[PDB]
From a paper:
Here, we report the cryo-EM−determined atomic structures of homogeneous amyloid fibrils assembled in vitro from apo, reduced forms of the ALS-causing SOD1 mutants G93A and D101N.
We unambiguously constructed a structural model of G93A fibrils comprising a C-terminal segment (residues 82–153) at 3.09 Å and of D101N fibrils comprising a C-terminal segment (residues 95–153) at 2.92 Å. 3D maps of the G93A fibril and the D101N fibril revealed a single protofilament intertwined into a left-handed helix, with fibril core widths of ~8.1 nm and ~6.3 nm and helical pitches of 240.6 nm and 65.8 nm, respectively. The subunits within the G93A protofilament and the D101N protofilament stacked along the fibril axis with helical rises of 4.88 Å and 4.82 Å and twists of −0.73° and −2.63°, respectively. The G93A fibril core features a very compact and serpentine fold containing four β-strands stabilized by two hydrophobic cavities, whereas the D101N fibril core features a less compact fold and displays a totally different serpentine fold containing four β-strands stabilized by a hydrophobic cavity. The hydrophobic side chains of Leu84, Val87, Ala89, Ala93, Ala95, Val97, and Ile99 are located in the interior of the G93A fibril to form the second hydrophobic cavity. In sharp contrast, the hydrophilic side chains of Asp96, Ser98, Glu100, Asn139, Arg143, and Gln153 are located in the interior of the G93A fibril and form a hydrophilic cavity. Two pairs of amino acids (Asn139 and Arg143 and Gln153 and Arg143) form two hydrogen bonds to stabilize the G93A fibril core, whereas three pairs of amino acids (Asn101 and Lys136, Cys111 and Gln153, and Asn139 and Ser105) form four hydrogen bonds to stabilize the D101N fibril core.
Author numbering:
A (entry chain C), B (entry chain B), C (entry chain A): 82 to 153
């Protein structure tokens, strides 16, 4: 362990995500993303069972809408 | 372990994702992504069973809509 | 282990993804992605069984719509 690491002894589920990025825009007189009409609808309506022993590390959907940098 | 690593002793599920990126735009008088009309609909409505012992590391959909850099 | 690596002792499922990218746009007076009308519909409505012991590392669909760099 030096920056974060699951270390279980029976079951280790994870969603390790180490997205180290760098973005260096420049230049002038430039439009980026004039109009955006977005309709994200991540409407989780799941269901479980009489013994469903889920062990999810991340139980959800990632919905992104960008113009330059989408690190997902 | 030095930057994050599942190390279970029975079962180790994971979604390791180490997307280290670099983006260097430049130039001038330039449009990027004028109009966007997006309709993401990641509507999870799953179902489980009477003994479904799921062990997902990441139970979700990634929906992206970018113009330059999509690191998924 | 130095940057993240499943090391189970019975079962190790994974979705290792190390997409290290570099993008260097340039030039001027240039359009990139004028109009986009996207309709992502990753509508997971699966189903499980009376003993379905799933062990997925990443149970989801990646839906991207970019113009320059799609590292999936």
């Amino acid at each position: 362990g030096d920056l974060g690491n699951v270390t279980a002894d029976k079951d280790a589920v994870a969603d390790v995500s180490i997205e180290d990025s760098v973005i260096s825009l420049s230049g002038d007189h430039c439009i980026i993303g004039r109009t955006l009409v977005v309709h994200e609808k991540a409407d989780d309506l799941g269901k479980g069972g009489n013994e469903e022993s889920t062990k999810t590390g991340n139980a959800g959907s990632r919905l992104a809408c960008g113009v330059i940098g989408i690190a997902q």
